[PDB]
Amino acid sequence: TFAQRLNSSPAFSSFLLKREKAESEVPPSELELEAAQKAAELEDPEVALRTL
Amino acid sequence: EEEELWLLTLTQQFKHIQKHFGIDLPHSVVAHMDPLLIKKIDWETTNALEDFDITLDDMGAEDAKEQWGAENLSHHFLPLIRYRRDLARKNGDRYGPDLVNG
Amino acid sequence: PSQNLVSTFANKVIVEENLVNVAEIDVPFWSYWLSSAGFTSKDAFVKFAEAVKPKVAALSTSDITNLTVAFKRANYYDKDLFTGIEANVSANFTKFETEQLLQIVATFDAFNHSSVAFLDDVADSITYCNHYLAPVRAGADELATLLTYYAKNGHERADLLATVARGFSEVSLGKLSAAQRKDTVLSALKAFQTFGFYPESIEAVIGAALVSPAEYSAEELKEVEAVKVAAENALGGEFVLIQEG
Amino acid sequence: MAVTSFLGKAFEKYFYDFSAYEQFGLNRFLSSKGQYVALRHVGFVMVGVNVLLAANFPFNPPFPTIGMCPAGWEGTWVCQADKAKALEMYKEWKKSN
Amino acid sequence: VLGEVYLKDILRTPPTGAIPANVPHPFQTSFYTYATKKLIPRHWYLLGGFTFTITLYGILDGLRDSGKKKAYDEAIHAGKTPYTAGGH
Amino acid sequence: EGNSVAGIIKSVNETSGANLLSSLKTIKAQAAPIYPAAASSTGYSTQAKIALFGALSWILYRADGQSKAHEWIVDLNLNVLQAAWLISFSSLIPFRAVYFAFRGMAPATASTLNGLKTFSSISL
Amino acid sequence: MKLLPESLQQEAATAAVVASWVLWHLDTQLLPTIMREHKLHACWAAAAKRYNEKLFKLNPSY
Amino acid sequence: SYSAYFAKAGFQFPAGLSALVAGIVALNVCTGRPTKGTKEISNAEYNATPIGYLQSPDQHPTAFPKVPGMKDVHGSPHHHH
Amino acid sequence: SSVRDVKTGSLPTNFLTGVYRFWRSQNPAEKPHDPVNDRLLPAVVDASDKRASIGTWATTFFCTIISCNLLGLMPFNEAPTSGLGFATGLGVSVWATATILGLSKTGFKFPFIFVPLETISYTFRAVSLGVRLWVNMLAGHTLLHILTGMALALPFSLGFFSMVPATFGVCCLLSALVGLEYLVAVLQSGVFSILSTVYVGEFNHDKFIGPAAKIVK
Ligand SMILES: [Zn+2]
């Protein structure tokens, strides 16, 4: 998700933002959580061919 | 499969930009993926029009703002229309959108 | 005994054709700047045209622009060089800007040398590879020669015509002298009626003539009125001069 | 150690979770943490003024005192007002000390 | 088919070999392009303001040292010392 | 370095149907972009060393000049009065709120991108 | 106290040098970098509707 | 995912800082006047004078003065009183 | 040739984007009479090149003045804008920029008895724009010097770490004064650059060229 990609950004490995989490500011909604799960399913392309 | 390379290049390039923009995408990867967009934006910076979209929505121009955005991304359809122009030149006709009233 | 050596060395070491032996290792730079110093000298530009031929096809865009406007300003036309310059433009058309392509097209409109590939690649570059307000930054004395270069070869490119017609306005025509403004209004109206393309910004080219008719003949005002009637019928309205107030 | 990394991790620990607001108790006497840092600020200033006064104490003050005396001096060059008199008084006081 | 020479220098994909260098703006390469395209045609009012201030403050410095010269001369042509005898 | 979609197209076209679905993760990983791994540090580069040495040299030179300034203990205590507010700002400023509030100042980061809505650019 | 400087023109020229460098560094190094990432987003967000309609009309795969 | 590409480039100065530092030093050292506490003399006066008789007491104040006004050097005793 | 690579969405890029767009929104463009299309686009570009870059100048002055103002709040440092020549030179150079712009608009020609007092009210803002910044940066630091000279004498005369609350009640006041110094250091940069936009945008008005011919209906 967008917060989960912001957490791995260079801005959150800096010193003043090292203990913080990007989920704390605006949490991801349930649609982008389930879209992250569905996209984690489909990074195997044979899974995508068989479900398509 | 005739024009799959262009559409899938557009899809992959924008998917990577949108996945990484404003988080960790470097400017070199943006200028690599989209060189002519960076060229046009650098024309606006070079020719003192760095606030041109700010000027356009300062004067309420919405259609000129959409035209500015569409003319800065007009080179995305350049591979397609060059391919279709060379197809119509291999078949002796002329490419349709290159004509004034046709 | 100084005046004797100064008089014998004033044309033995310093002469206008030994500078062209140092000016061969970087020929677009020296070609452009000695052309801007007035050193036209066709018998040295024959040397220049063959001194650059084995390395034209790997040049920058600015080097090609320098070469092309220099050989315009020295009025020399080596077509065996200009095919290599056309190959350099057509192989790197995405890297040229409109301020370079207008100078290259003005040179090639002097020396009538064209291809379908060059016309298509220059139109593709000006339309899609450059900013859409780069005709606005151009000055109409070069957009008129671009329209002339396209109407001479009969190359109809409505995308290029709509892009180039942005650069015609009160602003870009008011920066011209009245003789040059008459020249560009005439050539622009002729090349606009040749293609049958009447954009909304043709009314600036027409009103550049209609607010001052004292510069044109009856035949030239007939040529302006013909395109005024055609553009009245094409744009679906009636022409009107606007007065301040 | 690495001269880039060990003190970096040590300062990360000291800044983030080596907190003396609870490791020295201190909830039982103060209301908030916004009141603790507001008092840690003035405590840092008072510690700084006391340390910089004490680190070189036998000195004649540049700042205008309010006609008071530090300790058992009371007439010395520490309590003088015109500076040349305190200057020569320090010049005689220094050879004896 | 559309065959990767229509996509040359127009559309590229995210790089797999190595991350390239950042394309410089024309102002970041040469100072002459900046100085002749933006600094003089757009910022010559600021440069004229900075030069006006530098010349005006040179004028004020000239007034101040001429006043110092006048006071020093009228102390020398009075037999008097022109300063506070140093201080020490 | 040619574009990776033509690499996908070529690497899919020259594979037999028996070993297509086995080979799909190899073509997926051959065209994934390069994210370079965390190389070994060798920290404090030459410009960072120039910065830290110049900052320490400036602090030492300014502290030599403050301590002989006729109001010298007042200057040495003003350094304390200022470092106290540096310490106080590093303790009550919300840095995640400041990060996401500066991020909202730019329109580039106040919202996500918008083009290419995935139905216009399918190749069926 | 320190009210007038030892040279007024030197301090005014220091102000001019510092503000002229900040103008150059803005206009040359920062504002291209500001405007690249601002106008990529801005051209996409303004173009998106007409771009997607033009691309819908241009591909034959429906 | 690009986070380890930016950690490779370390600290780096602003892209024209040498021009700013060169300009400020070329204003602070190319002044056109003696160096604020010194005075220009003739060469014979420089070669005739001892180094302690060439310094002023004002320009060497004590680094942590016990009395405000304490100086390190005392300079020339040749007062023209 | 070899410029540095920039992360997209960095915090300095976001901050400077917001700052530049703030100072550019102070002198907005004028909405013309005709609707903006390809006919009006060279007139809009031309009006955008006859407007001064007050956005760029104002963020130049905001960034240099807020960095010089916040230098005075770091330890071992003085503000450069607490110098009379620095701050007053920035003010006189903004006023001279506005005047040079307004002079190049008309002719480089210098303009009853009501108007020379309007001139000496107009030529005063050269003094006022600089010395507001200078006196604001000087007066807080001077009060800070004085009031910590009064705050040092009571731990001097009494014991260190003894009779604490009379020194606590003046160290709280010194802390509040340096907090006011931070607020003033931001607000005076803001006031200087708002006023630079006002003074320069008084003369930032030219003639919209527009269409001198039309095909109506
Ligand atoms: Zn101080």
* Helical pair B78-90 and B4-20, crossing angle rounded to 10 deg: 180
* Residues of chain E with C-beta less than 8 angstroms from the C-beta of B11: none
Which segments of chain D are extended strands (E)? none
Which residue matches tokens 């110098």?
Answer: I83
How far is residue G40's CA from residue G43's CA, in Å, rounded to a whole number?
5
How far is residue I178's CA from residue F78's CA, in Å, rounded to a whole number?
10
How far is residue C199's CA from residue C192's CA, in Å, rounded to a whole number?
9
How far is residue B75's CA from residue C159's CA, in Å, rounded to a whole number?
13
How far is residue I37's CA from residue C181's CA, in Å, rounded to a whole number?
24
CB C200 within 8 A of CB I216: no
Computed on alpha carbons and rounded to an integer, the radius of gyration of chain D in Å comes to: 22
Classify residue F98 as exposed, middle or buried by CB count within 10 Å of its CB (0-12, 13-18, 19+): middle
How far is residue B87's CA from residue B95's CA, in Å, rounded to a whole number?
8
| Inter-chain CB proximity G20 and E50 less than 8 Å | yes
Q: Residue F23: CB partners within 8 Å, gap ≥ 6? A: F11, F15
Q: How far is I148 from chain H (nearest CA, A)?
A: 17
* Residues of chain D with C-beta less than 8 angstroms from the C-beta of I163: none
| H or E, element range at E69 | helix E40-76
CB B4 within 8 A of CB B25: no
| Inter-chain CB proximity B64 and I21 less than 8 Å | no
**Nearest residue in D to F44, CA atom:** D4
Q: How far is H50 from chain D (nearest CA, A)?
A: 25
* Helical pair G8-25 and H17-28, crossing angle rounded to 10 deg: 170
D41 touches chain I (CB under 8 A): yes
Q: Range of I158's domain?
A: 1-217
Q: Count other Cβ atoms within 10 Å, centred on residue G59.
A: 18
Helix, strand, coil fractions of chain A, as percent rounded to 5: 45, 0, 55
Torsion of CA B77, B79, B80, B81, to 10 degrees: 80
Q: How far is B44 from chain G (nearest CA, A)?
A: 9
Q: Which residues of B touch F (CB under 8 A)?
A: 1, 3-5, 7-12, 14-18, 21-22, 29, 73
A10 touches chain I (CB under 8 A): yes
Candidates I45, I46, I216; nearest CB to C240: I216
How far is residue I69's CA from residue I193's CA, in Å, rounded to a whole number?
13
CA atoms within 13 A on the CB side of D63: 24
Q: What's the distance, Cα to Cα, between the start and end of chain E in Å?
A: 94
Structure tokens at F58: 């400036």
How far is residue I116's CA from residue I98's CA, in Å, rounded to a whole number?
18
Which long-range contacts link D92-95 to residues 24+ away (Cβ below 8 Å)? none
Q: Residue C133: CB partners within 8 Å, gap ≥ 6? A: B47, B49, B52, C166, I41, I45
CB C243 within 8 A of CB C211: no
Structure tokens at B4: 């799959």
Structure tokens at I118: 């309007």
Question: Furthest-apart CA pair in chain C: how many Å?
Answer: 84
Q: Count other Cβ atoms within 10 Å, centred on residue I125.
A: 18
Q: Count other Cβ atoms within 10 Å, centred on residue C35.
A: 23
How far is residue G20's CA from residue I60's CA, in Å, rounded to a whole number?
8
| CA nearest to I57, candidates H21, E49, B59, B41 | E49
Query: How many angstroms separate the Cα of G51 from the Cα of each of B66, B70, F110, I114?
Result: 10, 7, 22, 59
* Helical pair B63-72 and G31-58, crossing angle rounded to 10 deg: 90
Query: How many angstroms separate the Cα of I38 from the Cα of each of A6, C124, I211?
Result: 41, 19, 11
How far is residue H22's CA from residue H8's CA, in Å, rounded to a whole number?
29
Chains that touch H (3 or more CB pairs under 8 A): A, B, D, E, F, G, I
**Nearest residue in I to D49, CA atom:** I152
DSSP I164-213: -HHHHHHHHHHHHHHHHHHHHHHHHHHHHHHHHHHHHHTS--------SE
Interface residue of I1, I2, I8 to substitute, partner B, most B CBs within 10 Å: I8
How far is residue A46's CA from residue C150's CA, in Å, rounded to a whole number?
53
State the total domains in chain I. 1
Q: How far is F25 from chain D (nearest CA, A)?
A: 39
Structure tokens at H28: 């602070």
How far is residue F98's CA from residue F95's CA, in Å, rounded to a whole number?
5
CB F4 within 8 A of CB E16: yes
| Inter-chain CB proximity A8 and H6 less than 8 Å | no
Question: Structure solved using which method?
Answer: cryo-EM
| H or E, element range at E65 | helix E40-76
Chains that touch B (3 or more CB pairs under 8 A): A, C, E, F, G, H, I
**Nearest residue in B to F123, CA atom:** B4
F to G contact (≥3 Cβ pairs closer than 8 Å)? yes
How far is residue D90's CA from residue A6's CA, in Å, rounded to a whole number?
65
Tell me, rounded to whole angstroms, the distance of Cα H78 from its chain centroid: 27
**Nearest residue in H to B16, CA atom:** H1
Which long-range contacts link I112-118 to residues 24+ away (Cβ below 8 Å)? none
CB I26 within 8 A of CB I169: no
| Inter-chain CB proximity B77 and G50 less than 8 Å | no
| Inter-chain CB proximity D86 and H70 less than 8 Å | no
Handedness of CA E17, E22, E26, E32 (dihedral sign): negative
DSSP state of B97: G
DSSP state of H19: H
Q: Residue D56: CB partners within 8 Å, gap ≥ 6? A: H64, H66
How far is residue I131's CA from residue E77's CA, in Å, rounded to a whole number?
38
CB A23 within 8 A of CB H19: no
How far is residue C217's CA from residue C224's CA, in Å, rounded to a whole number?
10
Helix runs in chain I, H state only: 11-24, 41-49, 54-71, 84-106, 114-122, 125-157, 165-201
| Inter-chain CB proximity B3 and E1 less than 8 Å | yes
Local structure of I3: helix, strand or coil = strand
| CA nearest to I98, candidates I61, I47, I46, I52 | I52
Report the DSSP beta bridge partners of residue I3. Answer: E22
CB E38 within 8 A of CB B48: yes
Task: Let me know the angle formed at the C-alpha of I106 by I105 and I110, rounded to the nearest 5 degrees.
Answer: 115
| H or E, element range at I214 | strand I213-216
Which residue matches tokens 């600020």?
Answer: D41
Tell me, rounded to whole angstroms, the distance of Cα A12 from its chain centroid: 14
| CA nearest to A26, candidates B52, D79, F103 | F103
Q: Count other Cβ atoms within 10 Å, centred on residue I2.
A: 6
Structure tokens at F22: 């086995």
DSSP H16-28: THHHHHHHHHHHH
| CA nearest to B12, candidates E13, E10, F112 | E13
Candidates A5, A8, A10; nearest CB to H7: A10
Was I78 annotated as part of a binding site?
A: yes
Structure tokens at I107: 């002719």
How far is residue C58's CA from residue C43's CA, in Å, rounded to a whole number?
25
DSSP chain C: -HHHHHHHHTTTTS-TTTGGGTTTSSHHHHHHHHHHTT---HHHHHHHHHHSGGGGGG--HHHHHHHHHHHHHTT---HHHHHHHHHHHHHSGGG--HHHHHHHHHHHHHTT---HHHHHHHHHIIIIIS-TTTTTTT-HHHHHHHHHHHHHTT---HHHHHHHGGG-SHHHHHTS-HHHHHHHHHHHHHHHHHHT---TTHHHHHHHHHT-GGGS-HHHHHHHHHHHHHHHHHTTSEEEE----
| H or E, element range at E59 | helix E40-76
| CA nearest to I189, candidates I70, I56, I80 | I70
How far is residue B42's CA from residue B39's CA, in Å, rounded to a whole number?
5
Report the DSSP beta bridge partners of residue C240. Answer: I214
* Residues of chain I with C-beta less than 8 angstroms from the C-beta of D61: 152-153, 156
CA atoms within 13 A on the CB side of E40: 7
| Inter-chain CB proximity I11 and A11 less than 8 Å | yes
**Nearest residue in I to A6, CA atom:** I9
How far is residue C224's CA from residue C213's CA, in Å, rounded to a whole number?
10
Q: What are residue C241's phi and psi, to 5 degrees?
A: -75, 140
CB G43 within 8 A of CB C131: no
Query: How many angstroms separate the Cα of C86 from the Cα of each of C61, D50, D55, E4?
Result: 12, 82, 81, 22
How far is residue A14's CA from residue I7's CA, in Å, rounded to a whole number?
14
CB I111 within 8 A of CB I130: no
I7 touches chain H (CB under 8 A): yes
Tell me, rounded to whole angstroms, the distance of Cα D58 from its chain centroid: 15
Torsion of CA C96, C98, C99, C105, to 10 degrees: 90
CA of residue F51 to ligand 1 center, whole Å: 24
| Inter-chain CB proximity H31 and G25 less than 8 Å | no
G46 touches chain B (CB under 8 A): yes
Structure tokens at I6: 């920039």
Query: How many angstroms separate the Cα of D18 from the Cα of each of A19, D12, D63, E80, I35?
Result: 13, 9, 38, 69, 64
* Residues of chain E with C-beta less than 8 angstroms from the C-beta of G20: 46-47, 50
Q: Residue C3: CB partners within 8 Å, gap ≥ 6? A: none
Which amino acid makes up residue H44? A
| CA nearest to E47, candidates E55, E57, E39 | E39
Candidates B35, B78, B99; nearest CB to C158: B99
| CA nearest to C119, candidates C138, C100, C147 | C147
How far is residue B50's CA from residue G32's CA, in Å, rounded to a whole number?
8
Was I205 annotated as part of a binding site?
A: no
Local structure of I216: helix, strand or coil = strand
Was I181 annotated as part of a binding site?
A: no
Classify residue D58 as exposed, middle or buried by CB count within 10 Å of its CB (0-12, 13-18, 19+): middle
Neighbours of ion ligand 1 (CB under 5 A): F 78
Structure tokens at E14: 């995210």
Q: How many C/I residue pairs have CB atoms within 8 Å?
A: 81
How far is residue E30's CA from residue G6's CA, in Å, rounded to a whole number?
37
How far is residue B5's CA from residue B11's CA, in Å, rounded to a whole number?
10
I216 touches chain C (CB under 8 A): yes
Query: How many angstroms separate the Cα of C144 from the Cα of each of C136, C189, D82, D96, I90?
Result: 13, 9, 87, 99, 47
Task: Let me know the angle formed at the C-alpha of E23 by E22 and E24, rounded to the nearest 5 degrees.
Answer: 105
Classify residue B19 as exposed, middle or buried by CB count within 10 Å of its CB (0-12, 13-18, 19+): middle
Handedness of CA I81, I82, I83, I88 (dihedral sign): positive
CB G48 within 8 A of CB B65: no
Local structure of H71: helix, strand or coil = strand
Strands C238-241, I213-216: parallel, antiparallel or unpaired by DSSP? Answer: antiparallel
Q: Residue C122: CB partners within 8 Å, gap ≥ 6? A: C89, C93, C101, C104, C105
**Nearest residue in B to F106, CA atom:** B22
Handedness of CA D65, D70, D75, D77 (dihedral sign): negative
Candidates F73, F82, F105; nearest CB to I74: F82
CA of residue E53 to ligand 1 center, whole Å: 27
Report the DSSP beta bridge partners of residue E22. Answer: I3
Q: Count other Cβ atoms within 10 Å, centred on residue H7.
A: 13
Structure tokens at C141: 């004395």
Question: Furthest-apart CA pair in chain H: how many Å?
Answer: 80
Structure tokens at D21: 């607001």
Tell me, rounded to whole angstroms, the distance of Cα E20 from its chain centroid: 32
CA of residue I75 to ligand 1 center, whole Å: 9
| Inter-chain CB proximity A17 and F95 less than 8 Å | yes
CB F76 within 8 A of CB F66: yes
How far is residue I127's CA from residue B97's CA, in Å, rounded to a whole number?
63
Query: Which region, left, alpha or beta, applies to residue I198 given φ > 0 means left and ψ of -120 to 50 means alpha?
Result: alpha
Q: What are residue I215's phi and psi, to 5 degrees?
A: -115, 95
Report the DSSP beta bridge partners of residue A41. Answer: none
**Nearest residue in I to H6, CA atom:** I7
Q: Residue C221: CB partners within 8 Å, gap ≥ 6? A: C209, C213
Which amino acid makes up residue F10? K
DSSP state of H48: H
CA atoms within 13 A on the CB side of F65: 9
| Inter-chain CB proximity D46 and I164 less than 8 Å | yes
Q: What is the 3-state secondary structure (H, E, C) of chain F?
A: CCCHHHHHHHHHHCCCCCCCCCCHHHHHHHCCCCCCCCCCCCCCCHHHHHHHHHHHHHHHHHHHHHCCCCCHHHHHHHHHHHHHHHHHHHHHCCHHHHHHHHCCCCCCCCCCCCCCCCCCCCCC
CB I5 within 8 A of CB B24: no
Chains that touch E (3 or more CB pairs under 8 A): B, C, F, G, H, I
Q: How far is E19 from chain F (nearest CA, A)?
A: 7
Chains that touch G (3 or more CB pairs under 8 A): B, E, F, H, I
* Helical pair I84-106 and G8-25, crossing angle rounded to 10 deg: 60
Q: How far is B36 from chain H (nearest CA, A)?
A: 23
This PDB structure is determined at a resolution in Å of 3.0
Local structure of G59: helix, strand or coil = coil
Which amino acid makes up residue C22? V
